[PDB]
Amino acid sequence: TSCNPSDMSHGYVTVKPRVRLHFVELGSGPAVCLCHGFPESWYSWRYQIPALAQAGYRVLAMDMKGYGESSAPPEIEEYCMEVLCKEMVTFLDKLGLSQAVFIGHDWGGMLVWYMALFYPERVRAVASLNTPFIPANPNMSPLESIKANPVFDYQLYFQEPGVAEAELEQNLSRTFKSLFRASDESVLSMHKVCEAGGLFVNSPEEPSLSRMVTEEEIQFYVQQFKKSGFRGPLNWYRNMERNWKWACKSLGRKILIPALMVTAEKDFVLVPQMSQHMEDWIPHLKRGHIEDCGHWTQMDKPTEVNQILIKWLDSD
Amino acid sequence: TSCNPSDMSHGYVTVKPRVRLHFVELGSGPAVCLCHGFPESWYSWRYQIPALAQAGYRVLAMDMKGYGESSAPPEIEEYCMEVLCKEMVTFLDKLGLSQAVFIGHDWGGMLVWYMALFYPERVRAVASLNTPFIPANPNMSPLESIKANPVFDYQLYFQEPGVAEAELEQNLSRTFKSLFRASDESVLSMHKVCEAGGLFVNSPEEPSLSRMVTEEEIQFYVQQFKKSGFRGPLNWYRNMERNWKWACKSLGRKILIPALMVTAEKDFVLVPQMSQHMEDWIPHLKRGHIEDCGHWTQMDKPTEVNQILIKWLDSD
Ligand SMILES: O=C(O)CCc1ccc(OC2CCN(C(=O)N[C@@H]3[C@@H](c4ccccc4)[C@H]3c3ccccc3)CC2)cc1
Ligand SMILES: O=C(O)CCc1ccc(OC2CCN(C(=O)N[C@@H]3[C@@H](c4ccccc4)[C@H]3c3ccccc3)CC2)cc1
């Protein structure tokens, strides 16, 4: 039911001179591109990859730009949505794929919505875990939105280059054990990160292992993040104004391709209600909802994710 | 239309601890595995890769074991057909492909025939360029056949490890310019190589560039063979007894899957008549024949090769 890295096919595509994207590939059938979130890995889809391949799909599980074996340039602007989306289009071009299904989670979810929005001709169908699609508001900036919702306070802490990197890189095992937990096992507040000083300022120095993960799984992420660290990943958060301006160029165009929104009951940041009016701008939207499921959806409720994704893939 | 290496998707599969296979991958649809000959490269399929992908296939063009970015262990036994075939099956396993169409040329052609014989469950259909399928004769050794068939004298020269390697690696540019030519541009013979002292003993020191290839194309081969040299590739020739004994264990069984044999009029070693009685053992065999075509079929007559392969793939 899982993936051993050394038993996978590893693919590499150069999308521009010094930027190549790494992916793992399994199965035959229609192409399904899986896009993980922050701070994760292709390996976050470990339970989906075999299930989707067994269900008759060709699965391409990405290391997103900044992660794993994919390139991680230091410049903030390399990680704006416009650049990341164009790169994923180039990825498809070099692989000779006219279209793929795009399934994303967290920041990967944001990316796949923008792929569906701006490059619908290359997106056969789109699915997001947790991350809603909300049309850009030309009137209020991203900075004003974060004031209007204090649950996104931590995003301010991620802004200054090097600050969050230092904390997240200091002890990688502690970082991932602290983060990758079921909602009832949480050891972190994301209410007021900035005044406290950081994410882990008064969370355990030696956290226990979540019921969700093994020591071996944790050590995989540890080894992956030794390659490039957290700068590239955090740069995803540092293009708020650029992403806003790009998203506003959408005007009011709808997403007319088949779409799936999957909500997670106990994700306390990307809460299910954030998705509530999505059918207004996505006419062919279908839904899934997973109870007792926190942020780390693929890990927390793999069986439920697999059922929902496969049902949806097979029907449209 | 051809391939630029830096614009391809490069895949890597570890089939056992010391051995990984490299391939380039283009297109969507049924999996088609392309297997090159001696001393070539995935790049020998450069004209077929985009044509087949455009025709609606997912093309996997291999660096065969011993070549390019694939592993090239020193031991002779690592290149016997039994080992090479098992590894190709493991390759399919790791990619999650239950079956593939196998298309081979030269030594690659011999490989795909053996795949069809011993692993019919993993081969959807089989095609060979130039290399016929001749059932093993248990009453004659391979060594005995080379004495009866002097055109294969050069194979005796390839036996002694280190000898052919030194000549072929002495000047790679000269090596490939001398080999890769149209039949009417020939600058060497394979009549009496051993007593002559080598392959290039009295062929030009600075050969002209064949009509078939550009300087840039030659230099790609040069660059590729700088990594591991000719030991691995030549080891394909140094398993005659093992291959013969293995082939003899398949005597009774037949190839029932769809099959294509493409002959080249001006291949003076793998002559068309070598294939003449193949329908005795494969009654449903289909055929293509290319006029004015030397040994390097894909390079020599790419348009004709593309037409024949696509017609065949689309019908059976
Ligand atoms: O139009 C409008 O109003 C705005 C619409 C809009 C809607 C959604 C949206 O989500 C994107 C930005 C925020 N983002 C995260 O910060 N994920 C948290 C990671 C994290 C944060 C902090 C530390 C580590 C990891 C995850 C996490 C979440 C919950 C629990 C654990 C981890 C995910 C993607 C963007 C825009
Ligand atoms: O049962 C029976 O009668 C025997 C049946 C049987 C039938 C066929 C057969 O072909 C295999 C062995 C011979 N082999 C080569 O030596 N290829 C030559 C390369 C080469 C040789 C020498 C130098 C460089 C490259 C190519 C070449 C050929 C012609 C011109 C240029 C290059 C290709 C595969 C094996 C068994």
Swiss-Prot record, chains A, B:
GO terms for molecular function: 10-hydroxy-9-(phosphonooxy)octadecanoate phosphatase activity; epoxide hydrolase activity; lipid phosphatase activity; lysophosphatidic acid phosphatase activity; magnesium ion binding; phosphatase activity; protein homodimerization activity; toxic substance binding. A lipid is attached at C293 (S-(15-deoxy-Delta12,14-prostaglandin J2-9-yl)cysteine). Inhibited by 1-(1-acetylpiperidin-4-yl)-3-(4-(trifl uoromethoxy)phenyl)urea (TPAU), 1-cyclohexyl-3-dodecylurea (CDU), 12-(3-adamantan-1-yl-ureido)-dodecanoic acid (AUDA), 1-((3S, 5S, 7S)-adamantan-1-yl)-3-(5-(2-(2-ethoxyethoxy) ethoxy)pentyl)urea (AEPU), N-adamantyl-N[']-cyclohexyl urea (ACU), 4-(((1S, 4S)-4-(3-((3S, 5S, 7S)-adamantan-1-yl) ureido)cyclohexyl)oxy)benzoic acid (c-AUCB), 4-(((1R, 4R)-4-(3-((3S, 5S, 7S)-adamantan-1-yl)ureido)cyclohexyl)oxy)benzoic acid (t-AUCB), 4-(((1R, 4R)-4-(3-(4(trifluoromethoxy)phenyl)ureido)cyclohexyl)oxy)benzoic acid (t-TAUCB) and to a lesser extent by 8-(3-((3S, 5S, 7S)-adamantan-1-yl)ureido) octanoic acid (AUOA). It is an enzyme of class 3 (hydrolase). Residues 6-316 are annotated as: Epoxide hydrolase. It comes from the Eukaryota. Its cofactor is Mg(2+). The modification N6-succinyllysine is found at K192, K226. It catalyses: an epoxide + H2O = an ethanediol; (9S,10S)-10-hydroxy-9-(phosphooxy)octadecanoate + H2O = (9S,10S)-9,10-dihydroxyoctadecanoate + phosphate; 12-phosphooxy-(9Z)-octadecenoate + H2O = 12-hydroxy-(9Z)-octadecenoate + phosphate; 12-phosphooxy-(9E)-octadecenoate + H2O = 12-hydroxy-(9E)-octadecenoate + phosphate. The N-terminus is blocked. The active site is at D106 (nucleophile), Y237 (proton donor), H295 (proton acceptor). Keywords: Acetylation, Aromatic hydrocarbons catabolism, Cytoplasm, Detoxification, Hydrolase, Lipid metabolism, Lipoprotein, Magnesium, Metal-binding, Multifunctional enzyme, Peroxisome, Phosphoprotein. Homodimer. Belongs to the AB hydrolase superfamily. Epoxide hydrolase family. This is Bifunctional epoxide hydrolase 2. It comes from Homo sapiens. The gene is EPHX2. The chain holds residues 230 to 545 of 555 of the full protein.
